[PDB]
């Protein structure tokens, strides 16, 4: 039974899980876009947003600094978090990362996912887009919307 269990069991155990996620997160901070197995990415996603929140909390803050020091193995990334990533997202209250499923891995046929920090410099992903408003169904519904607003 695993009712209300929120964390996956991965790696060689709890510490190993932390270390695996830490490496993925370090990769994400450096590269701003990471391919990895879907489950591992999904697990890391939460930590990614939390890290930005601690980044926002301030450079001078000792608590935030300690957290940043732990989660970023490469130390050059710690300035980047506080001075680049945190100021970028100052406007929005969340939804810093974007996760999309990728065609399965060649070797082991693993479910794969791309994770990026929003507003990166890199070429945009081929994101899924909803149908145009000018489609037949959308036209009919626009007609309906117009009729309803005219009624009021």
């Amino acid at each position: 039974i695993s009712h209300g269990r929120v964390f996956r069991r991965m790696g060689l155990g709890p510490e190993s899980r932390i270390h695996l996620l830490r490496n993925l997160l370090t990769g994400l901070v450096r590269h701003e876009r990471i391919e990895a197995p879907w489950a591992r990415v999904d697990e890391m996603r939460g930590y990614a947003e939390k890290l930005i929140d601690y980044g926002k909390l301030g450079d001078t803050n000792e608590r935030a600094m300690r957290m940043a020091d732990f989660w970023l193995t490469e130390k050059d990334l710690i300035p980047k978090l506080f001075q680049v990533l945190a100021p970028r997202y100052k406007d929005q209250t969340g939804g810093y990362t974007r996760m999309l499923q990728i065609p399965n891995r060649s070797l082991d046929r693993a479910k794969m996912a791309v994770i990026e920090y929003k507003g990166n410099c890199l070429p945009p992903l081929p994101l899924p887009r909803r149908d145009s408003h000018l489609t037949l169904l959308n036209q009919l519904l626009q007609g309906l919307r117009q009729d309803l607003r005219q009624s009021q």
């Binding site: 450096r30 590269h31 876009r33 490469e74 130390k75 050059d76 990334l77 300035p79 980047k80 001075q83 680049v84 970028r88 999309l100 499923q101 990728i102 065609p103 791309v114 410099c121 890199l122 070429p123 945009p124 992903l125 081929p126 899924p128």
Partner: protein, 108 residues
Amino acid sequence: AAPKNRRTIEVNRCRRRNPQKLIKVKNNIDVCPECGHLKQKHVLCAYCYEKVCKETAEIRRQIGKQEGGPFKAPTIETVVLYTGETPSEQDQGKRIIERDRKRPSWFT
């Protein structure tokens, strides 16, 4: 615990040709509007993604070239400029990445 008797081809066929064993037909397959190659819905188009990844790799090679050695992550934002492009007011005070090719249509 060993088999008491050889299982026949009739019984074996029944086991291994069961619908449960069979491969299921997929209804997720649609044409990617951008390239015309087949994509599974809910999944990024393989062709389009490969294209984006190739460009990303090239930019990253250039990033590494400009940085020089490890532990040289900039403390400023980055922008990528292609041939016949100049930094704007926004692009001023950002790290400039130069590419030897033209702007892709999809890159905006």
